[PDB]
Structure 1
Amino acid sequence: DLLKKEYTGITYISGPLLFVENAKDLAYGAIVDIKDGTGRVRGGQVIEVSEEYAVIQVFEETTGLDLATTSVSLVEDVARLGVSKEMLGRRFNGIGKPIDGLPPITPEKRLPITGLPLNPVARRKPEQFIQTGISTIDVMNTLVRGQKLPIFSGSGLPANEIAAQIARQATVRPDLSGEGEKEEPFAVVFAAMGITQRELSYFIQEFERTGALSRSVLFLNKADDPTIERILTPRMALTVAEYLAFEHDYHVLVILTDMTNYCEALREIGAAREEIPGRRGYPGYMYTDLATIYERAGVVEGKKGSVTQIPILSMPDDDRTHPIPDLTGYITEGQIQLSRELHRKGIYPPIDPLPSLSRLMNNGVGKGKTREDHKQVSDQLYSAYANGVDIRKLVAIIGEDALTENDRRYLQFADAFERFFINQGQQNRSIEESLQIAWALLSMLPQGELKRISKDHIGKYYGQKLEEIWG
């Protein structure tokens, strides 16, 4: 038409919802603009429709709205975001508007933010090993390109510093696999849900220090921003990441700051609609909603791009059985779990190796990729550490003097393992140095009890002294 239609029959405003009764023309899932009587425009999304009435959720706050003057206008039927290659180095808010003072982006394409599932035929196996520079991740919980590897954190634990260090130090090793020329740097897409000024300032300073803002795209949604806007931020971030990776052959690394806040907003919307709850408070469909976010990563046959995700989430009472960590561990391809007890002893990074897991480790290790002894060394380290922890629990009861020689050896191995292997500070370690330290630690035990390593590898590498590396 020459001028667009407006709907005025609004009789309900309560919380985030809003009912309009003359709106059968609005498509399900459409985006609308809510006009105040003073001229202010607020956005909203339609999730119900009938010949009787329609239900609209509001992104911004509902202060100042009235039932006599408010009107609803129509934007396009599908939530679409305009993307371009020119948007590298820009900053955006939670809904995609610029906040850096620069003119807006002229779109090359406009894409639906909900995305589409990847065809399981069109995928391929993640293979490339990524050297993060942290021994407890490189050796025992290896990260490969194309993996979803969330970080399970507490309240006072430093997950942000670990994420920044990984993003700074991450690189591939073409020389080990023989793939030829060195890579190009990762492109970082940073999506922030409800985040304090302290964490945001730290992240901005860290990215400015290394010059990574020229490659990055930032979607920011602060703690004082409206809550319902957090629904759209991960979807827009992943739309941009998918476009860059699969249309321009970039290697994209995506960081999601706190999935807990996203789940809180989701619970707010679900409880407003009287949905059937899940276990504690959260709606019953939360598994499906999280699955549409995580499962957008991976690699695609016949294309050079890749998408890697590092979500960060906080287990509330350090509880692994909470619904959010449970569903995340069901969907993702592993987890890195931080330990508070190691943090209290001054160990950084405080990664607890036993609850940690990497599902796609076996694709990226072995001969011709890193080295031939990687997997057996990892297994032996795991078994020895478990024995050390069990002997700790034993000497908590019976006392140190009652120990034999074997239990004392395992106990000393566990202590030295923590102090030297885990505690590394801000230093950067290559894979060879980490393997050398791991072999030096295993040399504290007799050859008889390490049954998980083949005798050739023992004959080749066993016998190193730790004093040469640390003295």
Structure 2
Amino acid sequence: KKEYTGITYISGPLLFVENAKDLAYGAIVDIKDGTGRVRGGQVIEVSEEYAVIQVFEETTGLDLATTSVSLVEDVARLGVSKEMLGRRFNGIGKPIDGLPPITPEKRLPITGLPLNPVARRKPEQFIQTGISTIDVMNTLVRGQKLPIFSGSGLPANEIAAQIARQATVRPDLSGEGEKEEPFAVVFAAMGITQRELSYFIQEFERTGALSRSVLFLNKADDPTIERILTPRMALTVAEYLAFEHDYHVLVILTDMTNYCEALREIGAAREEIPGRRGYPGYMYTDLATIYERAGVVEGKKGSVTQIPILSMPDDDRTHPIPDLTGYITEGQIQLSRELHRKGIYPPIDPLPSLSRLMNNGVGKGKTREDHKQVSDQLYSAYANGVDIRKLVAIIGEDALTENDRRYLQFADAFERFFINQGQQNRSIEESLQIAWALLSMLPQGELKRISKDHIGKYYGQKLEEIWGAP
């Protein structure tokens, strides 16, 4: 309707418009020029004398004589529906799959509301991911925030695609079996290149995993404000689905480092003094507003699970982005470059990995009762074997005792069979069977952490099953 034409200043990504006191702070506007192009903008400062608008994309063709600004929406909103399952969006809700836009059942603000702490309940059920080093040793519980730490060259995208493609719930282990459970995946990628985009599209299209998934894909050459807005839209969709239709959603965020760098650029563009190491001082709160939208609510059946993926800039755990994520999230999964260069995929290092909510998800009634002791014994045996392997190169193999050579065999057999699974999809029973097969190479009485009832039932099985096709 009304248009403002009092542009008085254009420089870089900003422009000033006079007599614009009707524009609410944070509103979305349209910038139209004489050549017919239309650009979007967001108001960042409102004053009595002028208003400040930050422009999406470049400001090439603009001028102070013909530019006009019109209001679009006061609060950024997203139109959601249950038809979003199977659709691809660019990060601000625009479809990019060539299909016509959906009809919205509702329109919701993308900025979140904090959950009441008295309204939450304790997580108690696990999610089967199909990866042995995650399902057995670092079990993922519904309602947990479990980040994944990777380096520059490690295959984080392939692991994310595999986890999204293989993950499911297991109601048959939950009591007598329960019934059908709705499941969904929300996949948000920020600052990806064309190669990663094509790989993700092909991976989700080649097996039917797109039929239950929503994709929010923001490219590296897209405007940075879209990169800021993408995770909030993804979490809005996830929360709507989970707390209005009892879905079990699983949110995967591809690169939090790109989000942090976009936040730094946005803060610099608004002339804010940076905090530690040039990052904004409110990065802790901004990250907390994203991670703390996951959880499970008392009186509801749905849940939200998050797997953030971030790349440490110099493999430094003291960088602010890995440091602040540790305080908010419960545990971490760390990828190792040594296992990657040794030809092992997925290169998950079990020793620096940790899940802090595992004890609430393992146990009888929800999985097999020998989960915790098997995991602890595997951890201890691997920790012994890795050091024995380094002592061997100095003192020689003959100078060892017998149990030292047994541990030395266990370490490399473990690395070759339990971790290096490739593109397999292993259920929890398969992984537990392989773990018991690996422990059978150790003598009885060496397994101090396992009760004798489980030893009398599962010990002594041969390793040649997975040996058929490792």
TM-score range, shorter chain: over 0.9
Query: Given that residues 60 and 229 in structure 1 are in contact (C-alpha distance below 8 angstroms), is that contact kept between their aligned partners in structure 2?
Result: no
Deviation per residue, 1:107-127 (Å, 9 max, x gap): 221110002111111122222
TM-superposed CA distance for 1:184, in Å, is 4.2
TM-superposed CA distance for 1:181, in Å, is 4.5
Query: Given that residues 250 and 305 in structure 2 are in contact (C-alpha distance below 8 angstroms), is that contact kept between their aligned partners in structure 1?
Result: yes
The answer to which of 13-22 and 333-342 deviates more is: 13-22
The answer to which of 395-404 and 304-313 deviates more is: 395-404
When residues 188 and 144 of structure 1 are mapped into structure 2, their CA distance, relative to the original with a 3 A threshold, is same
Deviation per residue, 1:173-192 (Å, 9 max, x gap): 22222253443452222222
Question: How far apart in 2 are the matches of 1:221 and 1:143?
Answer: 27
TM-superposed CA distance for 1:399, in Å, is 5.1
The answer to which of 458-467 and 436-445 deviates more is: 458-467
Secondary structure of 2:86's counterpart equals coil
TM-superposed CA distance for 1:395, in Å, is 4.1
Secondary structure of 1:261's counterpart equals helix
The answer to which of 181-190 and 61-70 deviates more is: 181-190
Query: Given that residues 417 and 466 in structure 2 are in contact (C-alpha distance below 8 angstroms), is that contact kept between their aligned partners in structure 1?
Result: no
TM-superposed CA distance for 1:429, in Å, is 1.6
TM-superposed CA distance for 1:268, in Å, is 0.5
Query: Given that residues 21 and 51 in structure 2 are in contact (C-alpha distance below 8 angstroms), is that contact kept between their aligned partners in structure 1?
Result: yes
Partner residue, 1:223: 220
TM-superposed CA distance for 1:469, in Å, is 5.3
Secondary structure of 2:49's counterpart equals coil
Deviation per residue, 1:71-93 (Å, 9 max, x gap): 32222321111112233322221
Partner residue, 2:109: 112
TM-superposed CA distance for 1:380, in Å, is 1.5
Query: Given that residues 172 and 183 in structure 1 are in contact (C-alpha distance below 8 angstroms), is that contact kept between their aligned partners in structure 2?
Result: no
Give 2:180's match in structure 1, choosing from 160, 183, 186: 183
Query: Given that residues 291 and 331 in structure 1 are in contact (C-alpha distance below 8 angstroms), is that contact kept between their aligned partners in structure 2?
Result: yes
Query: Given that residues 128 and 145 in structure 1 are in contact (C-alpha distance below 8 angstroms), is that contact kept between their aligned partners in structure 2?
Result: yes
Question: How far apart in 2 are the matches of 1:394 and 1:16?
Answer: 60
The answer to which of 424-433 and 437-446 deviates more is: 437-446
Residue ranges of structure 2 left out of the alignment (5+ in a row): none
TM-superposed CA distance for 1:283, in Å, is 0.9
TM-superposed CA distance for 1:467, in Å, is 4.1
Aligned pairs for 1:26-65 (under 5 A) are 26-65=23-62
Deviation per residue, 1:355-380 (Å, 9 max, x gap): 22222211110122212211111111
TM-score, L = length of structure 1 = 0.92
When residues 175 and 106 of structure 1 are mapped into structure 2, their CA distance, relative to the original with a 3 A threshold, is closer
TM-superposed CA distance for 1:400, in Å, is 4.7
Query: Given that residues 60 and 228 in structure 1 are in contact (C-alpha distance below 8 angstroms), is that contact kept between their aligned partners in structure 2?
Result: no
Question: How far apart in 2 are the matches of 1:469 and 1:154?
Answer: 30
TM-superposed CA distance for 1:271, in Å, is 1.8
Question: How far apart in 2 are the matches of 1:311 and 1:380?
Answer: 29
Query: Given that residues 171 and 181 in structure 2 are in contact (C-alpha distance below 8 angstroms), is that contact kept between their aligned partners in structure 1?
Result: no
Question: How far apart in 2 are the matches of 1:234 and 1:353?
Answer: 29
Question: How far apart in 2 are the matches of 1:392 and 1:429?
Answer: 29
Question: How far apart in 1 are the matches of 2:407 and 2:125?
Answer: 35
The answer to which of 315-324 and 367-376 deviates more is: 315-324
When residues 464 and 215 of structure 1 are mapped into structure 2, their CA distance, relative to the original with a 3 A threshold, is closer
Deviation per residue, 1:311-364 (Å, 9 max, x gap): 222222233222222222222232222111101111111111112222221111
TM-superposed CA distance for 1:397, in Å, is 5.2
Query: Given that residues 182 and 247 in structure 2 are in contact (C-alpha distance below 8 angstroms), is that contact kept between their aligned partners in structure 1?
Result: no
When residues 7 and 395 of structure 1 are mapped into structure 2, their CA distance, relative to the original with a 3 A threshold, is farther
Question: How far apart in 1 are the matches of 2:465 and 2:125?
Answer: 32
Secondary structure of 1:401's counterpart equals coil
| Number of equivalences | 468
When residues 424 and 82 of structure 1 are mapped into structure 2, their CA distance, relative to the original with a 3 A threshold, is same
TM-score, L = length of structure 2 = 0.92
Query: Given that residues 150 and 334 in structure 2 are in contact (C-alpha distance below 8 angstroms), is that contact kept between their aligned partners in structure 1?
Result: yes
TM-superposed CA distance for 1:142, in Å, is 0.4
Deviation per residue, 1:294-321 (Å, 9 max, x gap): 2112222222222222222222223322
Question: How far apart in 2 are the matches of 1:107 and 1:214?
Answer: 19
When residues 18 and 464 of structure 1 are mapped into structure 2, their CA distance, relative to the original with a 3 A threshold, is same
Query: Given that residues 151 and 311 in structure 1 are in contact (C-alpha distance below 8 angstroms), is that contact kept between their aligned partners in structure 2?
Result: yes
Question: How far apart in 2 are the matches of 1:396 and 1:285?
Answer: 50
Query: Given that residues 146 and 331 in structure 2 are in contact (C-alpha distance below 8 angstroms), is that contact kept between their aligned partners in structure 1?
Result: yes
Deviation per residue, 1:40-88 (Å, 9 max, x gap): 2211222222324333222222222223332322223211111122333
Question: How far apart in 1 are the matches of 2:173 and 2:111?
Answer: 39
Deviation per residue, 1:184-240 (Å, 9 max, x gap): 452222222121222111211121122122322222222222223211111111111
The answer to which of 370-379 and 179-188 deviates more is: 179-188
Query: Given that residues 182 and 246 in structure 2 are in contact (C-alpha distance below 8 angstroms), is that contact kept between their aligned partners in structure 1?
Result: no
Query: Given that residues 169 and 181 in structure 2 are in contact (C-alpha distance below 8 angstroms), is that contact kept between their aligned partners in structure 1?
Result: no
TM-superposed CA distance for 1:452, in Å, is 2.2
When residues 399 and 7 of structure 1 are mapped into structure 2, their CA distance, relative to the original with a 3 A threshold, is farther
Query: Given that residues 16 and 269 in structure 1 are in contact (C-alpha distance below 8 angstroms), is that contact kept between their aligned partners in structure 2?
Result: no
Secondary structure of 2:218's counterpart equals strand
- Superposition RMSD on alpha carbons, in Å? 2.2
When residues 324 and 433 of structure 1 are mapped into structure 2, their CA distance, relative to the original with a 3 A threshold, is same
When residues 324 and 39 of structure 1 are mapped into structure 2, their CA distance, relative to the original with a 3 A threshold, is same
Question: How far apart in 2 are the matches of 1:155 and 1:469?
Answer: 31
Partner residue, 2:20: 23
TM-superposed CA distance for 1:244, in Å, is 1.6
The answer to which of 8-17 and 434-443 deviates more is: 8-17
The answer to which of 183-192 and 340-349 deviates more is: 183-192
When residues 322 and 398 of structure 1 are mapped into structure 2, their CA distance, relative to the original with a 3 A threshold, is farther
Question: How far apart in 1 are the matches of 2:52 and 2:288?
Answer: 25
Secondary structure of 1:402's counterpart equals coil
Secondary structure of 2:276's counterpart equals coil
Give 2:6's match in structure 1, choosing from 9, 13, 36: 9
When residues 69 and 148 of structure 1 are mapped into structure 2, their CA distance, relative to the original with a 3 A threshold, is same
Question: How far apart in 2 are the matches of 1:225 and 1:155?
Answer: 22
